[PDB]
């Protein structure tokens, strides 16, 4: 286990949504992802976005310090985001294998 005060690096490998992101009773969205890599433990990049060019964060990531905990292939983790009203994208990962899911939050 890592020592006190050490952050993990960002996960470098690919993620996939294991199932459709699901809206909670009060309008947040829960996500489960599976991770192809063996560089874990590592930090899961996760945000909402409205512009896929700037990737400027909108809404909020609720999960504090989302991580892949396992060093073994195909492990899973869950996180929760708070989308803006209207349309946005759930964006998991950074780099050439980032995944997106279009989301709509009603009033």
């Amino acid at each position: 286990m890592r020592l006190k005060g050490v952050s993990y690096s960002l996960c470098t490998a690919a993620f996939t949504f294991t199932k459709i992101p699901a809206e909670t009773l009060h309008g947040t969205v829960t996500v489960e992802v599976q991770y192809a890599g063996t560089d874990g433990p590592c930090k899961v990049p996760a945000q909402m976005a409205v512009d896929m060019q700037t990737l400027t964060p909108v809404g909020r990531l609720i999960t504090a310090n989302p991580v892949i905990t396992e060093s073994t292939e195909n492990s899973k983790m869950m996180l929760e985001l708070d989308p803006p009203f209207g349309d946005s994208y759930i964006v998991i990962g950074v780099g050439e294998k980032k995944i997106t899911h279009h989301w709509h939050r009603s009033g």
Partner: antibody
Amino acid sequence: QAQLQQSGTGLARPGASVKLSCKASGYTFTSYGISWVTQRAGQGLEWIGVIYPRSGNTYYNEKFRGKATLTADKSSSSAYMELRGLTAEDSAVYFCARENYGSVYWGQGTTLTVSS
Amino acid sequence: DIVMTQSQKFMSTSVGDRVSITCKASQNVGTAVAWYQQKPGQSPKLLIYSASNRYTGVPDRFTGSGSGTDFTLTISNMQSEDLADYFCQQFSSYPYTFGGGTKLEIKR
């Protein structure tokens, strides 16, 4: 830049074993798996199996159990596939590929012809 | 093991056509599907990953869609350089099986 370089014997007699090599560079070998894929002439791709060099864990397509044995050497970032008991039906192109839920990086392929 | 079925092994298309390539999984694979194109003598090249994400450098003519068991690669405004073999592949569980391939050829 991630690269996979393949090598191996191209011509074998029935009954022979051949060890194919896949030399990785330009990325961290222990962060991803390496799979092997075969393609008969004019036919489709078939996934043989994968090794994850970080642990040595392997997973095989049952159709290739025993026919193919996957190994890896962390010290040199090399993966190997030993094809045993070759028959004419094993004549094919064999690729290695990095595993990442959609292989971007592939070896160039080795063409194996098995004939008496 | 999961079977990925590409029922159309050969498709004839004209430049400019909307090309639809279908891949059917024998059980639910979520969005864990990639699409590749391959030209003779070369390794396959990744086009789409996790069902609907276009890989960098791939022309925007290529779009993947679908989830569950039914997946589609659409090539809008098909160009002659798009003539190739196309394969889907699933990553839901081992073995990471490929579809049987669809070979795109040109009409005259």
